[PDB]
Amino acid sequence: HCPLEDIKVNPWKTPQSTARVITLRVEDPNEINNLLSINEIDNPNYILQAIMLANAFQNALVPTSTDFGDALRFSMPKGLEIANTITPMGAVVSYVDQNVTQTNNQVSVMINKVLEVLKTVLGVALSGSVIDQLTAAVTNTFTNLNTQKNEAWIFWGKETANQTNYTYNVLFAIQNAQTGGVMYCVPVGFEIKVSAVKEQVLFFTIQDSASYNVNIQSLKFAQPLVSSSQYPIADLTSAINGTL
Amino acid sequence: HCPLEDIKVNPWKTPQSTARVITLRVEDPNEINNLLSINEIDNPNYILQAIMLANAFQNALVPTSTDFGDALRFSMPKGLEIANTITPMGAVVSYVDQNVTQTNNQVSVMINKVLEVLKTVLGVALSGSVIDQLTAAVTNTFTNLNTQKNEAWIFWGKETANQTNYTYNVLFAIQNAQTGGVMYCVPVGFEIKVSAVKEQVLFFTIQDSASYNVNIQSLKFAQPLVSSSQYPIADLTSAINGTL
Ligand code: NA
Ligand code: NA
């Protein structure tokens, strides 16, 4: 049943990941959290830590101006404020408040522009360790919005016949070989104006074309690792509920 | 600053969810898990339970036939077998092994056909409580494949000039008001033949058109709830690593 061939090693062929992906949708949390929590972890003993950082940066969400609409977005300035109050004491490594704009380009181009900004915040090493989740997360900021439209991290502002305003709040927690003894926390507040009506925006794909004016606010926060292996699960449950 | 208007109550306007969403990507788990774990929970004390069910149904994954390609898929038959060995003892409520086919239709139609099958497995009540995650999950089975292409739950089979074969493995754990004293576990193994080359499949959207022959294998498993609030986090870490 079929002679065994000598190995032809293709060094560019990407091997299948061994990473385990678990998504939690927690109905009716005690306290509301309006940040999509995306966690890239190699040691589950740092999950609680990751969740607590998301709990902290919920307080850095601010309302948009009335002209934009009735929405919440992560504020870099308020983020810095909040950062200094977090225990255990960490360090703000970087922060950005930058506008991004394109005219009559594919949504895929916009995604790339935003990725560029976030990769600058993360850095090469950090970027590389989370590239799949980061790419997905940014993709899901501009597309796949129908299933997300009523979720806690996205807010619809003013909706004209030519334009849709909406905010999108995502937080990345990273702990792996590229981070060492700290966990990086990167909250992102998107303020997005797009040149389509909401009904079209809801079904936008990477192929669609549109003009965007987008403000990106983010910081990168390094907190020394604290394992939670010895605490009861009740404490994790509490962290998730935001009551810890 | 602007007279307060009497309330105009629109009873169809869907309110924003309060649900908290947390995604974990666990790099280098001790034991490999090839099921995308999607958890709809109202009490985080049942997370460990949810993860342990995913650990169990990893053993119900079987290789496809050589004609299809080198892929793993959840097997309903092997699932039933595995079900009977799970402790604490639960009950197989339903199971399906059904082919789904369409000709020259939009991908959105295929998604709807698959949703129909999975909703039949779940039932009205259960379906309704997880509709967003279920819709997203099925959408992500047929689209958004580029960021997923190297992940642990998707396997690429034979790839011709006219057809692409791939498997997709997703597990839903549900615990809320619609489940009561049990948690429902619904693993799904997709075996998908699509009439496009891989390069196109990778960037398929809901708008694209294609022909599909798809086999869906799933069961619905009810396990009585066991809270884990009093165990150490180490046990959750262990469950995630599949060493518990
Ligand atoms: Na939906
Ligand atoms: Na990618």
Author numbering:
A (entry chain BBB), B (entry chain BBB): 6 to 249
What did the study's authors say about this model?
We produced sub-micron-sized crystals of Cyt1Aa in vivo by recombinant expression in an acrystalliferous strain of Bti (4Q7). Using SFX at the CXI-SC3 micro-focused beamline10 of the Stanford Linear Accelerator Center (SLAC) Linac Coherent Light Source (LCLS), diffraction data extending to 1.86 Å could be collected at room temperature (RT) for the wild-type (WT) Cyt1Aa protoxin at pH 7 (“pH7” dataset), from sub-micron-sized crystals injected by a MESH device. Clear residual density allowed us to build most of these residues (H6-L249). At the monomeric level, the Cyt1Aa protoxin displays a conformation overall similar to that of the activated toxin, with two outer layers of α-helix hairpins, αA/αB and αC/αD, respectively covering the hydrophilic and hydrophobic sides of a central five-stranded mixed β-sheet (namely β2-β5-β6-β7-β3). In vivo-grown Cyt1Aa protoxin crystals are remarkably packed, burying 40.1% of surface area at crystal contacts (5484.2 Å2 out of 13661.2 Å2 of total monomeric areas), compared with only 13.3% (1252.7 Å2 out of 9405.5 Å2) in crystals of the activated toxin grown in vitro. Examination at the unit-cell level reveals that the Cyt1Aa protoxin crystallizes as a domain-swapped (DS) dimer13 with strands β1 (contributed by the N-terminal propeptide) and β2 entwined at the DS interface (interface #1), aligned with a crystallographic two-fold axis. Formation of the DS dimer thus likely precedes crystallization in Bti cells. Strikingly, residues absent from the activated toxin structure are the main contributors to the packing of the natural crystals. Most notably, the N-terminal propeptide buries 73% of its surface area (2704 over 3691 Å2) across nine interaction zones, contributing 34 H-bonds, 10 salt-bridges and a disulfide bridge at position C7. This disulfide bridge is aligned with the other crystallographic two-fold axis.
The active ingredient of Bti is a parasporal body that contains three natural sub-micron-sized crystals of four highly efficient mosquito-specific toxins, namely Cyt1Aa, Cry11Aa and co-crystallizing Cry4Aa and Cry4Ba. Following ingestion by mosquito larvae, the crystals promptly dissolve in the alkaline environment of the gut (pH ~11), releasing protoxins that are activated into toxins through proteolytic cleavage of propeptides by gut enzymes. Each activated protein eventually self-assembles into cytolytic oligomers that perforate gut cells, leading to mosquito larvae death. Here, we use serial femtosecond crystallography (SFX) at an X-ray free electron laser (XFEL) to identify the features governing the in vivo crystallization of Cyt1Aa in Bti cells, and to track the structural dynamics driving natural crystal dissolution in the alkaline mosquito larvae gut.
